[PDB]
A paper describes a structure:
[name] and [name] are homologous EF-hand proteins with similar structures. Although separately localized within cells, both are actin-binding proteins that modulate F-actin rearrangement through Ca2+-independent actin-binding and Ca2+-dependent actin-bundling activity. EFhd1Zn, EFhd2Zn and EFhd1Ca comprised two EF-hands, a ligand mimic (LM) helix at the C-terminus, a PR region at the N-terminus and a C-terminal linker. In addition, we determined that [name] and [name] bind actin independently of Ca2+ or [name]+ and also exhibit Ca2+-dependent and [name]+-dependent actin-bundling activity.
To obtain EFhd2Zn, we added EGTA and EDTA to final molar concentrations 15 times higher (0.18 mM each) than that of the protein to the [name] proteins to remove native ions and then dialyzed the proteins. Thereafter, ZnCl2 was added to the protein solution to a final concentration of 0.75 mM. At a wavelength near the Zn K-edge (λ = 1.2851 Å/9648 eV), the Ca2+ f″ and [name]+ f″ were 0.9 and 0.5 electrons, respectively. For that reason, we cannot rule out the possibility that the anomalous signals for EFhd2Zn originated from Ca2+, because the wavelength for the EFhd2Zn data collection was near the Zn K-edge [Fig. 1(g)]. We used a single EFhd2Zn crystal to collect datasets at the peak and remote positions of the Zn K-edge, which are termed EFhd2Zn(P) or EFhd2Zn(R), respectively. After calculation of the anomalous difference maps for each dataset, the anomalous difference map for EFhd2Zn(R) was subtracted from that for EFhd2Zn(P) to calculate the ΔAno map. The peak heights of the ΔAno map calculated from EFhd2Zn(P) and EFhd2Zn(R) were 11.1 and 9.3σ in EF1 and EF2, respectively [Figs. 1(h) and 1(i)]. In addition, we confirmed that [name]+ mediates crystal-packing interactions between [name] molecules, which raises the possibility of the involvement of [name]+-mediated multimerization in AD.
Residue numbers in the entry: 82 to 180
The structure:
């Protein structure tokens, strides 16, 4: 992931790994819908059921309906590129994280 996401410092990615481990509650290397629900609540920005789904859908490049750490980094790639909507749960997740 350091090799691929060269637009991010090592400091940044590690902060994103920390966030990812923090909310991957089952500790199985993915963030599922339920996990993302709790995360957006913990961040103070709960999202609607369908909003959670599109969050995942937008960066779920392997269609497994879960988020891999690779797809978590896509959130931040997409956001830094200016590609997300602004009311969008993905943008909200990114701006509420502390990266
Ligand atoms: Zn998980
Ligand atoms: Zn549903
Ligand atoms: Zn996926």
């Amino acid at each position: 992931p350091y090799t691929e996401f060269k637009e991010f410092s090592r400091k940044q990615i590690k902060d994103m790994e920390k966030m990812f481990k923090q909310y991957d509650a089952g500790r199985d290397g993915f963030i599922d819908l339920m996990e993302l629900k709790l995360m957006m609540e913990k961040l103070g920005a709960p999202q609607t059921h369908l909003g959670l789904k599109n969050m995942i859908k937008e960066v779920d490049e392997d269609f497994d309906s879960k988020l891999s750490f690779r797809e978590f980094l896509l959130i931040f790639r997409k956001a830094a590129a200016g590609e997300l909507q602004e009311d969008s749960g993905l943008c909200v997740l990114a701006r509420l994280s502390e990266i």
